[PDB]
Design an enzyme around this catalytic site. Structure first.
Site, PDB file in Angstrom:
ATOM      1  N   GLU A  53      -3.747  11.316 -15.249  1.00  7.76           N
ATOM      2  CA  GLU A  53      -3.860  12.729 -14.942  1.00  7.76           C
ATOM      3  C   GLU A  53      -3.519  13.029 -13.491  1.00  7.76           C
ATOM      4  O   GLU A  53      -3.094  14.145 -13.178  1.00  7.76           O
ATOM      5  CB  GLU A  53      -5.268  13.177 -15.262  1.00  7.76           C
ATOM      6  CG  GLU A  53      -5.503  14.638 -15.238  1.00  7.76           C
ATOM      7  CD  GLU A  53      -6.982  14.912 -15.368  1.00  7.76           C
ATOM      8  OE1 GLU A  53      -7.654  14.171 -16.138  1.00  7.76           O
ATOM      9  OE2 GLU A  53      -7.479  15.832 -14.673  1.00  7.76           O
ATOM     10  N   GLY A  68       2.055  -6.532   8.429  1.00  8.02           N
ATOM     11  CA  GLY A  68       3.043  -7.365   7.781  1.00  8.02           C
ATOM     12  C   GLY A  68       2.625  -7.698   6.366  1.00  8.02           C
ATOM     13  O   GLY A  68       3.424  -7.561   5.439  1.00  8.02           O
TER      14      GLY A  68
HETATM   15  N1  LIG Z   1      -7.770   3.261   9.072  1.00 11.26           N
HETATM   16  C1  LIG Z   1      -7.675   1.946   9.248  1.00 11.26           C
HETATM   17  N2  LIG Z   1      -6.475   1.387   9.640  1.00 11.26           N
HETATM   18  C2  LIG Z   1      -6.371   0.048   9.819  1.00 11.26           C
HETATM   19  C3  LIG Z   1      -7.468  -0.776   9.611  1.00 11.26           C
HETATM   20  N3  LIG Z   1      -7.088  -2.048   9.862  1.00 11.26           N
HETATM   21  C4  LIG Z   1      -5.783  -2.049  10.220  1.00 11.26           C
HETATM   22  N4  LIG Z   1      -5.325  -0.757  10.199  1.00 11.26           N
HETATM   23  C5  LIG Z   1      -3.955  -0.310  10.518  1.00 11.26           C
HETATM   24  O1  LIG Z   1      -3.033  -1.258  10.020  1.00 11.26           O
HETATM   25  C6  LIG Z   1      -1.972  -1.458  10.932  1.00 11.26           C
HETATM   26  C7  LIG Z   1      -1.589  -2.933  10.957  1.00 11.26           C
HETATM   27  O2  LIG Z   1      -1.654  -3.444   9.643  1.00 11.26           O
HETATM   28  P1  LIG Z   1      -2.815  -4.473   9.212  1.00 11.26           P
HETATM   29  O3  LIG Z   1      -3.361  -4.091   7.856  1.00 11.26           O
HETATM   30  O4  LIG Z   1      -3.914  -4.501  10.247  1.00 11.26           O
HETATM   31  O5  LIG Z   1      -2.071  -5.901   9.136  1.00 11.26           O
HETATM   32  P2  LIG Z   1      -2.270  -6.883   7.875  1.00 11.26           P
HETATM   33  O6  LIG Z   1      -2.392  -6.075   6.606  1.00 11.26           O
HETATM   34  O7  LIG Z   1      -3.472  -7.777   8.066  1.00 11.26           O
HETATM   35  O8  LIG Z   1      -0.911  -7.744   7.818  1.00 11.26           O
HETATM   36  P3  LIG Z   1      -0.597  -8.845   8.951  1.00 11.26           P
HETATM   37  O9  LIG Z   1       0.608  -8.397   9.742  1.00 11.26           O
HETATM   38  O10 LIG Z   1      -0.309 -10.175   8.296  1.00 11.26           O
HETATM   39  O11 LIG Z   1      -1.788  -8.984   9.869  1.00 11.26           O
HETATM   40  C8  LIG Z   1      -2.454  -0.975  12.291  1.00 11.26           C
HETATM   41  O12 LIG Z   1      -1.506  -0.100  12.858  1.00 11.26           O
HETATM   42  C9  LIG Z   1      -3.751  -0.235  12.026  1.00 11.26           C
HETATM   43  O13 LIG Z   1      -3.636   1.107  12.439  1.00 11.26           O
HETATM   44  C10 LIG Z   1      -8.681  -0.222   9.217  1.00 11.26           C
HETATM   45  O14 LIG Z   1      -9.660  -0.942   9.033  1.00 11.26           O
HETATM   46  N5  LIG Z   1      -8.779   1.143   9.037  1.00 11.26           N
END
Ligand SMILES: Nc1nc2c(ncn2[C@@H]2O[C@H](COP(=O)(O)OP(=O)(O)OP(=O)(O)O)[C@@H](O)[C@H]2O)c(=O)[nH]1
Ligand SMILES: Nc1ncnc2c1ncn2[C@@H]1O[C@H](COP(=O)(O)OP(=O)(O)CP(=O)(O)O)[C@@H](O)[C@H]1O
Ligand SMILES: Nc1nc2c(ncn2[C@@H]2O[C@H](COP(=O)(O)OP(=O)(O)O)[C@@H](O)[C@H]2O)c(=O)[nH]1
Ligand SMILES: COc1ccc2c(c1)NC(=O)CN2c1nc(Cl)nc2ccsc12
Ligand SMILES: [Ca+2]
Ligand SMILES: [Mg+2]
Ligand SMILES: [Mg+2]
EC number: 3.6.5.-
Lengths: 298, 427, 437, 53
Positions: C254, C144
């Site tokens: 670039e 989110g």
């Molecule tokens: N590759 C990778 N993907 C991640 C990681 N952390 C979260 N994700 C992906 O991010 C998706 C969810 O988004 P998040 O970034 O965790 O959520 P947020 O940015 O904290 O936003 P909120 O909804 O407020 O929690 C999930 O489906 C995960 O697959 C990470 O450390 N590495």
């Protein structure tokens, strides 16, 4: 108990394949739009390859080879046979010219007069291709008749090319160098490889193997090896097989010519249950668990 | 992110008290409020459900409500009866007589602001108040009526926080009074409008589970509440313990409810254990998976195969190959793909926690938003008209100032709820 | 010399930005307290690494970073972690309550209330850089805050730094590791809004990175910590050109003219190899033709697709380690024959190559083995749209029933932004198809 | 096949190979942000209205 969907209700062939699968007591059918399938008996055009092989804990198989259309579209086949170096500018394909709307007999539709040809295509609006008519073809006696050979060819997930050893001819019950008895005794206007081989023996002093099937195998093998890198699914995240129909024409002195490659073929009625069985043994259960095929080794 | 817990009436306060005993033992907090704990997984998120106290004591963020004194008396005499903040025993003396109208409209009104004031005290001293989790039963008067009234008032003062309830559906197999279907329908009408998520804990199911599966001949409320705390501890697992999810009530509400009215869940537990007797072979991950999705481990009187899963939450507690869980959970969906709606893709998300419950080395809790739950409301709403079309027992309510028309709305709204649950079972 | 600012949004951004900065510090020899003994220009310099680091009078090397997350959970682990001293405190920003996997919650509701704070924190870094090139933004489509806040922030940078470049490292959502059911919603809404504000965006489909980890790293159930370390490995070679002396990809702009000829089609496909395990002992060392070849196997790409059924528009090859141009050419020539490499006619059928001799760096005790030579191919092939198809489908199944839309409308969003955002996506899939057949 | 642009460095080299030739301002932002916060303050105020009934 593997799952499978069905998305081509007009498929004469996989109709049987979907049937049998259920009656093994170990395959079940889901609805069209369920993603959780091990097998996709897919639609003919716009079959969604981009979405397969993505369901976790689900090996997925489909009955079409992405890009096979290179070998099965009239305009597109000549492109392949002339450009890619493996198919040289080749001794078993009739001379073809592709043309866009916007002895010298020929077919698209057939005549020796060129302009009859050009007017014909440009008055349609889509692109066709014109190709020397086989003036001296092998007329099956008694009848001085024209025929064509279709061998069905099945290609499994690991690109084993299997030739179905049941062939069939379509006959033309009075060829003359004048749509009558030139575009395809034997019930169904259809002769089968046993009888033809028999006739091949009594009329000519030869057999179906030496006189025709050698080069048919040299073709069916030569064509599917050319496009093998463009359509292989050896390291893909989903996997494909595809039953093919190669349409062959044998000229006056036992020269086999490839004509059409039909990538959505229907099988002759006599052989349906036999052919649709080897499909399941060979291309379906060899993923999700004598022979009626000739493995064409490459 | 502090949750605030409210229990109302006899039922609310007996099961309520079990939940606080059960999770206190998991988090290593004794009846004195001291932590004699092994792992610190027990303490990383202890503030969600517990207010940290002086001398490093932990007090539950729990408000005890009731119109008859005495149930809370017994609570204040149980082992973890002293863990509760003494001020938070807000109560009156009249009782509410298994009558919705008495507790919602007349008796409950006299004493409702007094509970609200306790609630308020707790909202201050919240860093980020998540919302409120209420326990109560729907077929009496204090929990059903005073409860649904209290829910309505909290939504007015705290309009933007999550509202979560554990409601005990009435069933004739464990019943108190013929008026029970009147209260349940009047309560379900409120529960539709002003809770984000309510765990339908059906007493019919608890009854049958004891009788048949646990093979208990004469099951008490003692034995129904064992299953209830086992489920309740299971469903709260991701809120209380650390893990990949780091789940919170507002996320659970978002992912679990495609449509705002269809927010009633069928909880499951496996293995189904009988109070006292432990059995000494722990389940095998393939075993938990089948039992948890099997109707016989459902705390609601609906067999899931008469409906479709809108969404599903699964929580495995114990030390196990998450690879194996991943596989087994994948297997159940792919093997039975028809019983999950296609139009909400990948609707079965799983979580896992190292800490298991007491007694069990390996447990699995199940939370499903299935279209089958309409079965339950169909049951309640038939028992209802059986009486209402004869205006049977209506004087007990009409006397308290309620109208026939009010019952017709409740019934009408509830039957609309069954219609809506039916719609997505065909899509 | 021109500085860049990295921006990590949400858990995904913050945790991958940690993954990168750790690898950057190992690559440049900067210890967790920001002291870089190799730097003789103590307190300054127009050196290459100063693109990502500024120096303090005390001689600290400080990331030109900024971590934002609507919850104080993740950036707190940064705040107490092995690299705490690296970042001054103002770089790490947290709220009190996340967006609950809701694009509308993080964009509109919780986002209007932290957006002004973040942009001033960002404005601080720009005022210390002599010429700002642009921003490298890390986030996830599915979050989110990952999705809602990023696109609110991307818009504002386009207003407050309009003359700068804005690159994107996005984690495309996949369900093994997905935590949320609405990620296809969050994906389309955030893509529709950012599309005009990003100059080049590299998608890492998590489904891909996961299998790469299982298969080639022999990792039964790969963790986020496994995934991110592989990602920054990719992220490091992709950005190594800015941090290091070189001649190819020397500034953010670039990237736009090597990989992105038409603007909307700005999603190059990363393919990296060899991912060899640290456990596996007695590993045959892979030759330039072997690893360069591997760039064309689909099982090494960050998004699972078939470039055979697509057209190329651009192709860079970033080697790292013992690699000489001779071998690169021989490998290319023979690879040309054996593969289905189809460019669009209005583009030349060539390969831009870079070689950096510092061989790949691997975190001690990490899972990646130490290799003599590595390559990362960055290819803008039309087949990446397979990803936009699959995403758009999931979006259509749910939206057709309006499932979960109420959670979005209740934040103030209107059903219209859903269809308007999907309309854009449908337009994007058509651009990809017209260019590819 | 033709090489071009080959540059050298103590860190490495770069070059190119060719196989063959070719053939919303801050105000409009704040405005739509406000339109969304109004629609919330309404839906909420309408929730509080129905509660007051
Ligand atoms: N590759 C990778 N993907 C991640 C990681 N952390 C979260 N994700 C992906 O991010 C998706 C969810 O988004 P998040 O970034 O965790 O959520 P947020 O940015 O904290 O936003 P909120 O909804 O407020 O929690 C999930 O489906 C995960 O697959 C990470 O450390 N590495
Ligand atoms: N070069 C050629 N010389 C002689 N006869 C030819 C020829 N090319 C085609 N024919 C004959 O004329 C027919 C023209 O039909 P065409 O090949 O267009 O149909 P098709 O093979 O696409 C039908 P299907 O898809 O049902 O197999 C061929 O089937 C063949 O019998
Ligand atoms: N499972 C369970 N159900 C209960 C318990 N106590 C009461 N109930 C149910 O609640 C209903 C009685 O309502 P009750 O809560 O006692 O009235 P209240 O005092 O006004 O809250 C009955 O139909 C019971 O089925 C209990 O301990 N366990
Ligand atoms: C159906 O898809 C779902 C369902 C449920 C959740 C999510 C996605 N995602 C979340 O972040 C929070 N949530 C959960 N909450 C809690 Cl307390 N326990 C569990 C247990 C398994 S999931 C879950
Ligand atoms: Ca310097
Ligand atoms: Mg009672
Ligand atoms: Mg977060």
């Amino acid at each position: 108990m593997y799952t499978f969907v069905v998305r081509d209700e007009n498929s004469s062939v996989y109709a049987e394949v979907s049937r049998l699968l259920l009656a093994t007591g170990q395959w079940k059918r889901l609805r069209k739009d369920n993603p959780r399938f091990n097998l996709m008996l897919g639609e003919r055009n716009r079959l969604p390859f981009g979405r397969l092989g993505h369901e976790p804990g689900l090996v997925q198989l489909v009955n079409y080879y992405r890009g096979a259309d290179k070998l099965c579209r009239k305009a597109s086949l000549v492109k392949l046979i002339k450009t890619s170096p493996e198919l040289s500018e080749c001794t078993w394909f009739p001379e073809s010219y592709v043309i866009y709307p916007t002895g010298n007999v020929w077919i698209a539709l057939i005549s020796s007069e060129a302009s009859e040809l050009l007017d014909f295509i440009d008055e349609q609006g889509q692109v066709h291709v014109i190709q020397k008519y086989l003036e001296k073809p092998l007329l099956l006696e008694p009848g001085h008749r024209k025929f064509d050979i279709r061998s069905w060819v099945l290609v499994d997930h690991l690109y084993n090319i299997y030739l179905y050893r049941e062939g069939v001819l379509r006959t033309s019950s009075p060829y003359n160098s004048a749509k009558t008895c030139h575009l395809t005794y034997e019930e169904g206007n259809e002769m089968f490889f046993e009888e033809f081989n028999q006739y091949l023996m009594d009329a000519l002093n030869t057999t179906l193997e030496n006189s025709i099937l050698l080069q048919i195998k040299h073709i069916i093998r030569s064509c599917l090896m050319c496009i093998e890198p463009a359509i292989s699914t050896k390291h893909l995240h989903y996997q494909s097989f595809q039953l093919f129909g190669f349409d062959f024409m044998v000229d006056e002195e036992l020269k086999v010519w490839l004509i059409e490659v039909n990538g959505a073929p229907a099988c002759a009625q006599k052989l349906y249950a036999e052919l649709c069985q080897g499909i399941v043994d060979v291309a379906i259960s060899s993923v999700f668990p004598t022979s009626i095929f000739i493995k064409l080794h490459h | 992110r502090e949750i605030v817990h409210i229990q109302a009436g006899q039922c609310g306060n007996q099961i309520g008290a079990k939940f606080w005993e059960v999770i206190s033992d998991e988090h290593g907090i004794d009846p004195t409020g001291s932590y004699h704990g092994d792992s610190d997984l027990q303490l990383e998120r202890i503030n969600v459900y517990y207010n940290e106290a002086t001398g490093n004591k932990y007090v539950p963020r729990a408000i005890l409500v009731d119109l008859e004194p005495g149930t809370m008396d017994s609570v204040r005499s149980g082992p973890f009866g002293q863990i509760f903040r003494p001020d938070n025993f807000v109560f009156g003396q009249s009782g509410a007589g298994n009558n919705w109208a008495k507790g919602h409209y007349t008796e409950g009104a006299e004493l409702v602001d007094s509970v609200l004031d306790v609630v308020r005290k707790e909202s201050e001293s919240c860093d980020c108040l998540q919302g409120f989790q209420l326990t109560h039963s729907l077929g009496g008067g204090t929990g059903s009526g005073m409860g649904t009234l209290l829910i309505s008032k909290i939504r007015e003062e705290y309009p933007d926080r999550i509202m979560n309830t554990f409601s005990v559906m009435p069933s004739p197999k464990v019943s108190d009074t013929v008026v029970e279907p009147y209260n349940a329908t009047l309560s379900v009408h409120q529960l539709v409008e002003n809770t984000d998520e309510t765990y339908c804990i059906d007493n019919e199911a608890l009854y049958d589970i004891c009788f048949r599966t646990l093979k208990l001949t004469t099951p008490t409320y003692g034995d129904l509440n064992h299953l209830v705390s086992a489920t309740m501890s299971g469903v709260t697992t991701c809120l209380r313990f650390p893990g990949q999810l780091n789940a919170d009530l507002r996320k659970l509400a978002v992912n679990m409810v495609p449509f705002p009215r269809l927010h009633f869940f069928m909880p499951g537990f496996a293995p189904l254990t009988s109070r006292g007797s432990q059995q000494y072979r722990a389940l095998t991950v393939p075993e938990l998976t089948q039992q948890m999705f099997d109707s016989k481990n459902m705390m609601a009187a609906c067999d899931p195969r008469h409906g479709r899963y809108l969404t599903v939450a699964a929580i495995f507690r114990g030390r196990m190959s998450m690879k194996e869980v991943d596989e087994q959970m994948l297997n159940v969906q792919n093997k039975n793909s028809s019983y999950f709606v296609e139009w909400i893709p990948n609707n079965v998300k799983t979580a896992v926690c190292d800490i298991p419950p007491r007694g069990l080395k390996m447990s699995a809790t199940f939370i499903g938003n299935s279209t089958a739950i309409q079965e339950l409301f169909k049951r309640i709403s038939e028992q209802f008209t059986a009486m209402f079309r004869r205006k049977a027992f209506l004087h007990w309510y009409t006397g308290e100032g309620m109208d026939e028309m009010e019952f017709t709305e409740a019934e009408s709204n509830m039957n609309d709820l069954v219609s809506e649950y039916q719609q997505y079972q065909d899509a | 010399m021109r500085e860049c600012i990295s921006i990590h949004v949400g858990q995904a951004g913050v945790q991958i930005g940690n993954a990168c900065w750790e690898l950057y510090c190992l690559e440049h020899g900067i210890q967790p307290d920001g002291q870089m003994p190799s730097d003789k220009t103590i307190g300054g310099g127009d050196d290459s690494f100063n693109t990502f680091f500024s120096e303090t009078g005390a001689g600290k090397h400080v990331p030109r970073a900024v971590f934002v997350d609507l919850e104080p959970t993740v950036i707190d682990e940064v705040r107490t972690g092995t690299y705490r001293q690296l970042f001054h405190p103002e770089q790490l920003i947290t709220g009190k309550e996340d967006a609950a996997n809701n694009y509308a919650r993080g964009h509109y509701t919780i986002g209007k209330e932290i957006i002004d704070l973040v942009l001033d924190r960002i404005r601080k870094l720009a005022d210390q850089c002599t010429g700002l090139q642009g921003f490298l933004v890390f986030h996830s489509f599915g979050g989110g805050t990952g999705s809602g806040f990023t696109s609110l922030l991307m818009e504002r940078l386009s207003v407050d730094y309009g003359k700068k470049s804005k690159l994107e490292f996005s984690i495309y959502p996949a369900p093994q590791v997905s935590t949320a059911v609405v990620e296809p919603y969050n994906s389309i809404l955030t893509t529709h809004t950012t599309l005009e504000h990003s100059d080049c965006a590299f998608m890492v489909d998590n489904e891909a990175i996961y299998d790469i980890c299982r298969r080639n790293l022999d990792i039964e159930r790969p963790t986020y910590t496994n995934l991110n370390r592989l990602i920054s490995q990719i992220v490091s070679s992709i950005t190594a050109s800015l941090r290091f002396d070189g001649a190819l990809n020397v500034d953010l702009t670039e990237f736009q003219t090597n990989l992105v000829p038409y603007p909307r089609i700005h999603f190059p496909l990363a393919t990296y190899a060899p991912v060899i395990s640290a456990e596996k002992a007695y590993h045959e060392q892979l030759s330039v033709a072997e690893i360069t070849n591997a760039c064309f196997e689909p099982a090494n790409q960050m998004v699972k697709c078939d470039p055979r059924h697509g057209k190329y528009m651009a192709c860079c090859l970033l080697y790292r380690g013992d690699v000489v141009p001779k071998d690169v050419n021989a490998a290319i020539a023979t690879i040309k024959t054996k593969r289905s490499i189809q460019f669009v006619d209005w583009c030349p059928t060539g390969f831009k190559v870079g070689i950096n001799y510092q061989p790949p760096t691997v975190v001690p005790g990490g899972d990646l083995a130490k290799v003599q030579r590595a390559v990362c191919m960055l290819s803008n092939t039309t087949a990446i749209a397979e990803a936009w198809a699959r995403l758009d489908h999931k979006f259509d199944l749910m939206y057709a029933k309006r499932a979960f839309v109420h959670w979005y409308v209740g934040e103030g969003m209107e059903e219209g932004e859903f269809s308007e955002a999907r309309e854009d996506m449908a337009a994007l899939e058509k651009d990809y198809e017209e260019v590819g057949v | 096949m033709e090489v071009i642009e080959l540059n050298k460095c103590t860190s490495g080299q770069s070059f190119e190979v060719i196989l063959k030739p070719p053939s919303p301002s801050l105000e409009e932002i704040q405005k739509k942000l406000e339109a969304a916060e109004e629609r919330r303050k309404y839906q909420e105020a309408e929730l509080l209205k129905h509660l007051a009934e």
